[PDB]
Amino acid sequence: TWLLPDGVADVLPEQAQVIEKLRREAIDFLAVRGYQLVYTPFIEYIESLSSLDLVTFKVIDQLSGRLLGIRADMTPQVARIDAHVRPVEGVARYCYAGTVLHTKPQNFNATRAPLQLGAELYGHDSIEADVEMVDVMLGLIENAYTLQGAHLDLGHVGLFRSLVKYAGLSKNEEHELSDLYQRKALPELAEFTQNMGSDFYALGRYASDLDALQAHLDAEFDAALNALKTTLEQIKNRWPALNVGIDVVELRSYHYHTGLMYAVYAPNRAAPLAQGGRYDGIGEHFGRARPATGFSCDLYALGFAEIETVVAPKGTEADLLKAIANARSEGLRVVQLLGNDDLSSIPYATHQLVQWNIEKI
Amino acid sequence: TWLLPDGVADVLPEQAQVIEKLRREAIDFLAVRGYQLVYTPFIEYIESLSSLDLVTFKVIDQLSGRLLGIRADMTPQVARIDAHVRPVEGVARYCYAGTVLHTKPQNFNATRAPLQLGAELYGHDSIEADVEMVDVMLGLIENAYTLQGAHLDLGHVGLFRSLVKYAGLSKNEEHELSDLYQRKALPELAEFTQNNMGSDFYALGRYASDLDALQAHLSADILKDAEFDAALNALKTTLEQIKNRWPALNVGIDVVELRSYHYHTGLMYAVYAPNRAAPLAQGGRYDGIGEHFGRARPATGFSCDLYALGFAEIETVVAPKGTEADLLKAIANARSEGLRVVQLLGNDDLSSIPYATHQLVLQQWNIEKI
Amino acid sequence: ETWLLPDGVADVLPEQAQVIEKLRREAIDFLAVRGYQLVYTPFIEYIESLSSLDLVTFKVIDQLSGRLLGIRADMTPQVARIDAHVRPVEGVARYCYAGTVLHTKPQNFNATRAPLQLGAELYGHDSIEADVEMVDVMLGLIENAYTLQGAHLDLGHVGLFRSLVKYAGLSKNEEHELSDLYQRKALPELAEFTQNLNMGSDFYALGRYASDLDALQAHLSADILKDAEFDAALNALKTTLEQIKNRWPALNVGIDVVELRSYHYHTGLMYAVYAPNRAAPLAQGGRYDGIGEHFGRARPATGFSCDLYALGFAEIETVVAPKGTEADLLKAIANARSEGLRVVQLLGNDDLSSIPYATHQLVQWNIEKI
Amino acid sequence: ETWLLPDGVADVLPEQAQVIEKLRREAIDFLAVRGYQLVYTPFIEYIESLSSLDLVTFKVIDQLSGRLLGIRADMTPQVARIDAHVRPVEGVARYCYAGTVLHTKPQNFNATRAPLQLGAELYGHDSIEADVEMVDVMLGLIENAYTLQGAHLDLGHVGLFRSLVKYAGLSKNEEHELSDLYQRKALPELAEFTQNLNMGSDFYALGRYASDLDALQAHLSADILKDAEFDAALNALKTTLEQIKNRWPALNVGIDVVELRSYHYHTGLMYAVYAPNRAAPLAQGGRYDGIGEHFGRARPATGFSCDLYALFAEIETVVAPKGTEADLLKAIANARSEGLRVVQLLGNDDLSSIPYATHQLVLQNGQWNIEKI
Amino acid sequence: DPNFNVMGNFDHGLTLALSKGRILKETLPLLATAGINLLEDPEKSRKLIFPTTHKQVRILILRASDVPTYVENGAADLGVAGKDVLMEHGAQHVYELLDLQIAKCKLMTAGKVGMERPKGRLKIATKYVNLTRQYYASLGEQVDVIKLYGSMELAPLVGLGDYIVDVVDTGNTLRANGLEPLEEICKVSSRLIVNKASFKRKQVLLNPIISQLEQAVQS
Amino acid sequence: VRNDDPNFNVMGNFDHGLTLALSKGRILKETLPLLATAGINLLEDPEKLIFPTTHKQVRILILRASDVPTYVENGAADLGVAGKDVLMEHGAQHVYELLDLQIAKCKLMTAGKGMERPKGRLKIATKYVNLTRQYYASLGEQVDVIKLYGSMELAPLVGLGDYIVDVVDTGNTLRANGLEPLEEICKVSSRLIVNKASFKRKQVLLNPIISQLEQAVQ
Ligand code: NA
Ligand code: NA
Ligand code: NA
Ligand code: NA
């Protein structure tokens, strides 16, 4: 009867203290960089959460008879806010930090209930918005955790998209290619590419190396390439100790991404610490089409010491309450014994109040 | 396509700033009084959330085939933690602050998604645990908001329960009475009590607000009953201590406040405010709340909707684009003091940030109002 | 209240069941001998399959796939799937069905959320004659099951409206808005909407003179009468009206050229049968070419359905014989059962009062009334 | 892939439908004349009503009440409700049903999540004779629908185990643990569990010699044989075994005294019919007194059910030409009257429009006749 | 006759499913006591249905994993499977009549020698997903699992689990790779399982063969 | 880079290097010569748990084939060798399939007993549950499946399936037991799969080794 579902756990006090502190400092790190905190709804009509699938928990709304979902990802929700609810005539920055639910664990995660923290920059077209976001993402990881041994993977979907356009491929061909690239299934890719098929093959074979790629290969393609090269340089400048790599056929959620792709990987981890991208017009479903770029992470991935508790005796004598108040004022956790309870009623006690002074044991 | 469901809203930045600040300060106020923050699961097997409803959203778990619920109330979850997960051999204190979901709005609330903050004290039998909790609840409301014109309603289910026991009423009779009392349907109560010890049952409803008038109309039989008298003393002692600690607070009595009678076992406490049907906060003694999950533990606690204790505009400083050290330095100092600073992007001018309130400008870099 | 059934849901107890079962079998059989082959459709399907043509469908998660299922609300799209994909017969095909469908809320002023839907489907023939058969079958089935005394056949044809939409070059939004106005016959709004609409006086005429072909043709422009497709639709309706009036001389037949129920998937003739003192028709159907295209091949298709409870409780006679296995007794029981009598034997030491609903006794062994 | 049906879910197309429909009607009718009155149970109910006896039940929210519904997985508890509350007949009552039930996952090694459950229920008679009737009805129905050639009847009785649990004074936990061990016939674990258990050698004997009444009675203690309730259960089984063996000499009958499927609501005789090369029985039933007590009055009750699919020739169609000439319609009507499937060509369609046509109505020497091809 | 026809329908007889390898070796002598012997060497043939010295018994040689599947479905009337495999598959649809007392081992937890218990929910690598969950549940505990099929001792060394659940015999493979056996979950041995339908309707044929296997084991 | 020590320590953390997961048996045999061309050799006979190599930043695991995709996608191995059949049945979404090693060639096929086609929904016995469903779906068909792990050829003979889906090489095991291969579903061979994270952050080490394996194959 105590059993929790698979992928669902309590966050008990030791872990909670660490995550809570981490949550606040991340929100605050974003706040002072202009990213305004919002709380998104936990439930929405399914169509609103599905504008970008199996992962979303679904329930019927008794008031409307329509299907709801529990949020699996706040990215489309903030898009709705920027597109419809707060149609700010200019650049806008928001952030969020809250539980999302998945019907089954995603990304080799232990939990069906990750604590998703993220940031969104709307209303600026140029590559510089992406540079800020990458910089913010890195800065937040550095603040929360560490970039020691970390790796930044930069991509750009405009390369593939441009080549699809120039070659005049159909939607079915484009979709089939994107699957092959995302699996980097190079044997199948060879067969599938045998119009401009040798460039499509080159894009997959030499995905990690701009030089080798340019050797083995249009305004829009060149603009995408410049956008990537400029980003690679600026980020390498700002973060000299950070490993940065390239993958021009990183096409995760290709359908709604429109430019630069960025994720941060760490030692001994399959899942990135954080991932984001350019996704112009993400909110067009909801109203106005807005330039948009952003990232998110699981806060548990950037995250358990013991808690110290002071025990004072029962009483309401002024000098005792005064000492308790001063202690609490300094951020100490103080409790008073209840009734005839002795100190053994608080077995996790680390300190005692006994002039009134605090001593260990 | 932008439509949100009824009772569901975004919390946009102006409101979010206020609530977030309120959330942190409340958690911290509880922390230093020994209440350790926990995060409860948003979903659980339905039986775990229902140990005490129509109100709980229900979904199938694809992994088990069992029915889940989304949490409507964290009280039973922390009970599980104390009963099974952390079986601390002694007194334990926890708190929580998170969204709960209701299939329909409860308590004349606007939202199907209230932000429930609460605290739980396990492992102490005596009335003093309840006194602490009442004191903590009041302290938290005072800290978050104000007790000016507030009203504390104190009750105790032991009075009714004791009289049910002494009179030898059946479960059906007890259940029917508890409905009548909770509606204070005094005409029906008159008829229902006409046919054992019925005049005391009627007295309990008629003179619910007045201990003196109640004791005058009660039979000596029931006043002599050990358990009834213990419950009455427990209420009288609490009324005195709380009135002492909070002289500026209005305190009342209602001995037939029997909300969720089935799992409450002692003192009842709630705080009401002007021009509000719903209390700001409500709690009670509920011994053995976690017995479903393992060990039976004395327990008392309260909760509130944090939106009910809660929207000023946000100030933003705009600096120009650049990475010159003296500029970044000034930005960093500003951000260090908790100011919200952004830099212009690309060729954007100041009109790109129309909600800008302040500028960083070279005069040395200074902040001035726009 | 543990016995409580949900609203709109009832047992069909034996008296009613006998009548409906008999009615079910005779209807299936009446269709069978006219070439309509019985199928059982699935009770559950992936939601997309049941929704190819909404709120009415009960929805559940499939644990095996994680995809959303629906309980069937209407078998029409299911048989379309069968004809389109499962049995791609190269030629004309006829099928029928008779089973419960579920609705989240009662539809069509129905008492039940669980109507017994019987229906027939004719696939693979383009010309109007397929519709004439179906109308004839529908009427024949109602006559067989019930009676056409005081019944009224409403004939329509969506091609008239659709043709005029085409000729006038209206947009989809305009077409959709018109179809709502016509379906409500909201003539004041229709007047306003057709003012400053291209060919608007024909659109208005279609609504004002919907019930009268003569009065309609008099008020229609020569432009639209000359249009090949409009005229073909009109001829199709006129020829159907004549043939049906011939075959069923005692039947009241009417016209409504702006009957546009589910306009989006209907493509030709519309047909429904009404009865005295009933808001809902006894049966309704239509031409819906390409209904199954979602599932595979595009097939001409026309069909109807009814709630079998709407065409539908006498007592049951039971013979009681004594306990025993003597050959002459069993013989008499067997002969009785052979003639279709309901015979039971007393159990153990039970007397005849154990069967209080007994109408007859077996007492040579003979049957006599009690 | 828009045509895709979910796993365990299939159309019943015409060839199979004809066979099952015929089978359905004849079964209902066979039951009708034996006093079992057909009812239709609801497809949906409040979950508590369908769960009075599961993971197997599909669950949906009722928008009208806010309560959880289930789709019926088993009609047994529904008819119990009818007998307990809706039709509180003061005496013996007999009902039957035949309809789809849904399971969230296939049960009993079944291909389908949507079996066609046919069943019968006898309420209001305490004695073993009610069970004998039901067994006899079940067998009769299978024989009528299909065949008992090479079939096997397994008879049990939960009263034996229940009586021994009572006499030995076992707790509910011990009783529950034993019932699991017996249902798995996990004899090694059963040995260990019974060793230092009160009256444990009788508990072991019950599992070891489950199939053989003689061998069982030889290994049972005189203590338990003397127990009134144990002996009554044993006599009830012995009398049933004899009567059924008499009535059905061509039927193989076996015993299993630790067949304890759904022990919690079964109270007496257990009965199921098995067939060659099938893991799942063709039909299973039992005594379950007080099954409907959840819904009102406590009623003696016994009954069985089967999947009708467990008990597909081509269809003949006659094609006649288009027309409404009286002599033609007359011939069509006579044919249809005899139960033939007759269609007329539509419009300008020729005979190739009906490729599955087996017969033609054709005018020969001035009369309309049916001929092949 | 080694080419005695035992193909197609065998409802009149018993289909016996044996686990290949060690279990086969130790089972065949027991079966010999019931007058059931192979008439050729399985290891030097490719065919998978074998006749026996008994005309109403034929033998299948399966992977151990398939034995419960075949038995519960009635494709075999009875079979020999490890207690571990049986209980992991689910034992509800067969009868476990005999402990053959062969291939004895223990299902155990195991991890790196002297490793401190990590904080938070444990991750267990195992092929015994269900048995792992039941075991931890009996302790009032709950875990994450990753299903693997082999080389279980590797999982902790490459960070796929904190601990493993696996069968342990000599326990030397563990000691070798810096692991140690921790808790015994249950004792494991090969068992004779019977299809329920077969048991009910083929007593005449089963009862003597089962009795003979029982006698054989007791010695 | 070179290493000749057979007891070279390759235990514990190996984030600086590559963990290579090989399928045991036939795939191992045909893989080891290829790896030799990239300067990666074992220093011991496996048949005699983690193995060092002649390369100090490469260690080898020998796994059951089923575990190879699991290990690779989870990052417990940086790269591995698995059959196309095993990879596609497991799911290939979380790894990169960089090379066809062109070894252990066979075909995934349907198979059955001159058996008459049965009337209802077909029942397929297979270990390749997902690939079976995709194949039948491509024909506009859907089937029941029973998951088995081995002795696939038995299933039709004892009525567990109407047909099977299994890998077929010589197809002699089938002919032996009265079965025949029917339809070819796809061509199967062993493939080099790489963990996505590893590929992105260990290019320096991977790129030359992958190139050398490519050269070796062609
Ligand atoms: Na985002
Ligand atoms: Na609470
Ligand atoms: Na229809
Ligand atoms: Na039944």
Author numbering:
A (entry chain B): 6 to 57, 66 to 207, 210 to 232, 239 to 324, 328 to 378, 383 to 389
B (entry chain A): 6 to 57, 66 to 208, 210 to 324, 328 to 380, 383 to 389
C (entry chain C): 5 to 57, 66 to 324, 328 to 378, 383 to 389
D (entry chain D): 5 to 57, 66 to 323, 328 to 389
E (entry chain H): 8 to 226
F (entry chain G): 4 to 51, 55 to 119, 121 to 225
Excerpt from the publication:
Following the short-form ATPPRT architecture, A. baumannii nonactivated HisGS (AbHisGS) binds HisZ (AbHisZ) to form the activated hetero-octameric holoenzyme (AbATPPRT), which leads to a substantial enhancement of the steady-state catalytic constant (kcat). To start shedding light on the structural underpinnings of AbATPPRT catalysis and help inform structure-based inhibitor design, the three-dimensional structure of unliganded AbATPPRT was determined at 2.40 Å resolution in space group P21, with the full hetero-octamer in the asymmetric unit. Each subunit of the AbHisGS homodimer interacts in a head-to-tail arrangement with the two active sites located at each site of a crevice between them. Furthermore, L. lactis and T. maritima HisZ lack the C-terminal domain present in both AbHisZ and P. arcticus HisZ. The open conformation is seen, however, in the unliganded form of P. arcticus ATPPRT. Here, we reported the crystal structure of AbATPPRT, which will enable structure-based design of orthosteric and allosteric inhibitors of this enzyme.
The first step of histidine biosynthesis in Acinetobacter baumannii, the condensation of ATP and 5-phospho-α-d-ribosyl-1-pyrophosphate to produce N1-(5-phospho-β-d-ribosyl)-ATP (PRATP) and pyrophosphate, is catalyzed by the hetero-octameric enzyme ATP phosphoribosyltransferase, a promising target for antibiotic design. The catalytic subunit, HisGS, is allosterically activated upon binding of the regulatory subunit, HisZ, to form the hetero-octameric holoenzyme (ATPPRT), leading to a large increase in kcat. Histidine allosterically inhibits ATPPRT in a negative feedback control mechanism.
